[PDB]
């Protein structure tokens, strides 16, 4: 534990902070490659935070 503390002298925390700053009704455009090089295709998703949007 002492070595860990001395060596700690995170990006995920900054992303969580960015999330905090988000008012809350954030819509995310997300598209990922999915299978049907190997045969595959692209799929699109759109996540809505709250029902208001």
């Amino acid at each position: 534990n002492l070595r860990s503390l001395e060596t700690y002298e995170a990006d995920k925390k900054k992303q969580v902070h960015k999330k905090r700053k988000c008012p809350g009704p954030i819509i995310t455009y997300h598209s990922v490659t999915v299978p049907l090089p190997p045969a595959r295709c692209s799929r699109t998703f759109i996540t809505f935070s709250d029902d208001a949007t």
Partner: protein
């Protein structure tokens, strides 16, 4: 692909050997070894470009191949070197003086290859998850040998939103400016949407994640002056000829910055050629300008053609050989073109027939060579075309004597036109 064969389409270069020895028939040319060797050596000089302000005058009788050898040199020069072909009567513009048009033509046949270091990131967008507030985003580029995820910024996210980039799109993002350039797609889109059907492009380079020093050579002519003369330049570079810009601070400054670029390694100068066909149409003022304009270091190689002997110079009363003042005529060196013989005429006619994809009998070739030696060569080509058409109409396979002899009476030559012209139609 649909471009019809013209009068000078049969020629496709200047037939020359390793030692510049002219050949009888090659690359669509025939005979005229002296003028062809002169063309070859002046083309070598052009491709060298070490000296500026050299002029050559192609003189000879009509039908000797002046425009032919000019187009042959133009073709042999090949791309990457500008070849500005212009007629003597094109300098007369109602919005720009003759000297201004000549300056435009001179600077238009000079090129500068501008080197530009670029840093482009490319790959396959596996994930373009963007969190729109209505600020946060990440891009997952994939290559055939490595992958990397990049945290996207606000402006980069906005740029990506501008140019719609779905998962699986092959894009080439410039790290310098962030311009979104889509090249294609790597796979279909879910096979479910009843729309947006296209073809899939090949995968990207394995090291496409970050190309460090992609070198792109932007080539532009010295006509870039149009980019400065007015705040809006596209109008002048595309259609507007009313470009009476100020010579001071534009010509001198552009030349100075071009010299600075050449000294600092940014760009390199590539002098082209300016071919003025029927230069005898130039006014004596234009010749006086060429006399001095031909002395600048940025002066291209000025090739000219004249179809006259002793003739009056336009804009004055006294006469000079080739219709050119004694000064400019003496400055340049002249390349005389000797007329073609019967064998050369027959060979040129055969080459033209091969170009037009038309076939005719041997007697047809002989009689047509005779007619061409009598009337002219271009008229012989006109008769070639007419007889080919008459044969096609006749359902024949090749043109016989009875078709050339028929089109000879159907279409008249100037020599026979003036003969039948004795009816004093008008004067």
């Amino acid at each position: 692909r649909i471009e019809r064969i013209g009068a000078h389409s049969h020629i496709r270069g200047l037939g020359l050997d390793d030692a510049l020895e002219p050949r009888q028939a090659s690359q669509g040319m025939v005979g005229q070894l002296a003028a062809r060797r002169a063309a070859g050596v002046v083309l070598e000089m052009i491709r060298e470009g070490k000296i500026a302000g050299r002029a050559v005058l192609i003189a000879g009788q009509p039908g000797t191949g002046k425009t032919a050898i000019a187009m042959g040199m133009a073709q042999a020069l090949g791309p990457d070197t500008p070849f500005t072909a212009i007629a003597g009567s094109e300098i007369f513009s109602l919005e720009m003086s003759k000297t201004e048009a000549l300056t435009q033509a001179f600077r238009r046949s000079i090129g500068v290859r501008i080197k530009e270091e670029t840093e482009i990131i490319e790959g396959e967008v596996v994930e373009i998850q963007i969190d729109r507030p209505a600020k946060v985003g990440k891009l997952t580029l994939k290559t055939t040998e490595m992958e990397t995820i990049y945290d996207l910024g606000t402006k980069m996210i906005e740029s990506l939103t501008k140019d719609k980039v779905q998962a699986g799109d092959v894009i080439t993002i410039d790290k310098a400016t962030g311009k979104i350039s889509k090249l294609g797609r790597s796979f279909t889109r879910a096979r479910d949407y009843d729309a947006m059907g296209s073809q899939t492009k090949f995968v990207q380079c394995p090291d496409g994640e970050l190309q460090k020093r992609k070198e792109v050579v932007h080539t532009v002519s010295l006509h870039e002056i149009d980019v400065i003369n007015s705040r809006t330049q596209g109008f002048l570079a595309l259609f507007s000829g009313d470009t009476g810009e100020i010579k001071s601070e534009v010509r001198e400054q552009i030349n100075a910055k071009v010299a600075e670029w050449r000294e600092e390694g940014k760009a390199e100068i590539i002098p082209g050629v300016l071919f003025i066909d029927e230069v005898h149409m130039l006014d004596i003022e234009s010749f006086s300008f060429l006399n001095r304009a031909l002395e600048s270091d940025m002066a291209p190689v000025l090739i000219m053609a004249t179809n006259r002997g002793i003739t009056r110079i336009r804009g004055t009363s006294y006469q000079s050989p080739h219709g050119i003042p004694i000064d400019l005529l003496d400055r340049l060196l002249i390349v005389s073109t000797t007329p073609y013989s019967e064998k050369d005429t027959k060979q040129i006619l055969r080459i033209r027939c091969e170009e037009e994809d038309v076939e005719m009998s041997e007697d047809a070739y002989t009689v047509l060579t005779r007619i061409g030696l009598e009337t002219s060569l271009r008229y012989a080509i006109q008769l070639i075309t007419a007889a080919s058409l008459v044969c096609r109409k006749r359902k024949g396979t090749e043109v016989q004597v009875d078709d050339i002899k028929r089109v000879y009476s159907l279409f008249l030559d100037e020599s026979r036109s003036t003969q039948y012209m004795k009816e004093y139609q008008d004067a």
